[PDB]
Enzyme design. Sequence first.
Site, PDB file in Angstrom:
ATOM      1  N   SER A  43      -6.550   2.670   8.670  1.00 52.77           N
ATOM      2  CA  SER A  43      -7.814   2.587   8.906  1.00 52.77           C
ATOM      3  C   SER A  43      -7.902   0.869   9.118  1.00 52.77           C
ATOM      4  CB  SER A  43      -8.549   2.903   7.318  1.00 52.77           C
ATOM      5  OG  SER A  43      -8.606   3.987   7.932  1.00 52.77           O
ATOM      6  N   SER A 210      -4.981   2.994   4.227  1.00 51.24           N
ATOM      7  CA  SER A 210      -4.404   4.085   4.491  1.00 51.24           C
ATOM      8  C   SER A 210      -3.715   5.222   5.628  1.00 51.24           C
ATOM      9  CB  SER A 210      -4.619   4.232   3.036  1.00 51.24           C
ATOM     10  OG  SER A 210      -5.436   5.420   2.778  1.00 51.24           O
TER      11      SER A 210
HETATM   12  B1  LIG Z   1      -7.732   4.663   6.274  1.00 54.57           B
HETATM   13  O1  LIG Z   1      -6.652   4.098   6.743  1.00 54.57           O
HETATM   14  O2  LIG Z   1      -8.422   3.749   5.424  1.00 54.57           O
HETATM   15  C1  LIG Z   1      -8.209   6.541   6.415  1.00 54.57           C
HETATM   16  C2  LIG Z   1      -7.771   7.330   7.361  1.00 54.57           C
HETATM   17  C3  LIG Z   1      -8.219   8.635   6.721  1.00 54.57           C
HETATM   18  C4  LIG Z   1      -8.610   8.950   5.920  1.00 54.57           C
HETATM   19  C5  LIG Z   1      -9.068  10.221   5.281  1.00 54.57           C
HETATM   20  C6  LIG Z   1      -9.350  11.384   6.379  1.00 54.57           C
HETATM   21  C7  LIG Z   1      -8.164  10.964   6.984  1.00 54.57           C
HETATM   22  C8  LIG Z   1      -7.723   9.437   7.663  1.00 54.57           C
HETATM   23  S1  LIG Z   1      -9.363   7.291   5.089  1.00 54.57           S
END
Ligand SMILES: *[B]([O])([O])C1=[C]C2=C([C]=[C][C]=[C]2)S1
Length: 261
Positions: A43, A210
């Site tokens: 993200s 994440s």
């Molecule tokens: B990020 O890298 O903070 C996020 C990636 C995803 C989220 C929710 C569902 C799938 C991927 S938050």
Amino acid sequence: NSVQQQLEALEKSSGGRLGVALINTADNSQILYRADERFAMCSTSKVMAAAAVLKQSESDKHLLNQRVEIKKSDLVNYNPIAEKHVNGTMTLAELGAAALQYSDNTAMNKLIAHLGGPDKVTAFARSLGDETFRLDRTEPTLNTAIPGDPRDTTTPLAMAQTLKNLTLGKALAETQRAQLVTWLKGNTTGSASIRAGLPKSWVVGDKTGSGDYGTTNDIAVIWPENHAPLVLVTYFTQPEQKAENRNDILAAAAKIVTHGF
Ligand SMILES: *[B]([O])([O])C1=[C]C2=C([C]=[C][C]=[C]2)S1
């Protein structure tokens, strides 16, 4: 023990791969650890998408208020802000806010689809002098973070250099630069990451990230109370696909590199 030794000792007990790039703008001195190695951004790449739209908005004064329809089909996984607007509309600015401050995936894909796709975000990054960043996919598949996979990756140093240019430097016009900062400072998702390793009174703007393989990231701009700003990127990923995310490792890495300021 030196900072380099503390980070190597932190990496070893972690069971994963640690990437750190700190930039002290006071004298442009750098603390680097696997800073030339590629990590899945997850993200954290949402910063580049939004920034691109802010750049567009420099020469189009009606852009950031341009309305974008949110339908049920647009809802991928995790849409904390966008779900509250199904059968309605969000402006690009509201999408740029939601993507950064709540890590909304619908918002991210709307920004990408507006720009013309992942390749266009890559192109923007290049125009800032960033020759490393590459966005290849949309949400949520850009978070697979498979070891050795080059898609949707960058290096800690390159992302620290670009974040510096974006928030403190020459990348965006002033009004746009100030908006990005405001967006990052109002992040709601980074309390247990880099922020947890810093003095409480320090002002911080960050974007967490994440993904799979326990990939746990955070990129921050830090304004001490009596010093010049610091730009910190902390990336971390692990061998096994269903590893747990480890924000505590990022907080630990932040504390190690700032012990002295
Ligand atoms: B990020 O890298 O903070 C996020 C990636 C995803 C989220 C929710 C569902 C799938 C991927 S938050």
